[PDB]
Design a protein around this ligand. Structure first.
Ligand SMILES: [Fe+3]
Ligand SMILES: [Fe+3]
Length: 188
């Protein structure tokens, strides 16, 4: 496969492309959203795996045919699975992939824990919830609470909902190049 450096160049290219996707309407695009999330993680003192999970959590959304092929999304569709599986294939840690794959479940948990959380959801997050099994029931919450990455998943999703700031200067994707290169190296 590609070197770690070039795998990261590919990821940065995919991140830059995601600027073309709306996130909070046209006002906040997906790249801006992802960069804010990475920043919240970083400046909260989170570890590199958390920062990378935050940066990359939405990479799996369908952007165009070529990028979706690059990531292998066809037949899978769910962005949390598409992104997590792509990163696993590149050699990211299981921890990073699980934080990403879990961010839909995290929303279902939060809504069930505090109905008021529903009010924090974007139009899209509110409607996708209808097709993700709705809020978790008690038994589902128990299982989720058992996960070794339970609280970390909740943090990722709290940052996710927060990643809609209109006037926030945060570093771009290149800022995280070394962090991604080091992660790939550590995980060989
Ligand atoms: Fe998402
Ligand atoms: Fe998100």
């Amino acid at each position: 496969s590609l070197s770690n450096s070039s795998k990261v160049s590919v990821l940065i290219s995919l991140l830059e492309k995601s600027r073309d996707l709306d996130y909070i309407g046209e006002a906040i695009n997906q790249l801006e959203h992802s960069l804010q999330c990475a920043y919240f993680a970083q400046r909260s003192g989170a570890d590199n795996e958390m920062v990378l999970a935050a940066l990359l959590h939405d990479l799996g959304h369908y952007c165009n045919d070529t990028s979706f092929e690059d990531m292998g999304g066809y037949g899978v569709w769910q962005h949390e699975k598409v992104g997590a599986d792509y990163l696993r294939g590149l050699g990211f840690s299981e921890r990073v992939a699980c934080l990403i794959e879990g961010h839909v479940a995290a929303k279902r948990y939060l809504v069930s824990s505090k109905a008021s959380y529903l009010k924090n959801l974007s139009d899209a997050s509110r409607k996708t919830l209808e097709y993700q099994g709705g809020p978790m029931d008690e038994g589902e919450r128990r299982l989720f609470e058992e996960r070794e990455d339970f609280k970390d998943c909740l943090k990722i999703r709290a940052w996710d909902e927060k990643g809609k700031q209109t006037d926030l200067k945060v570093p771009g994707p290149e800022h995280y190049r070394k962090m991604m290169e080091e992660h790939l190296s550590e995980n060989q």
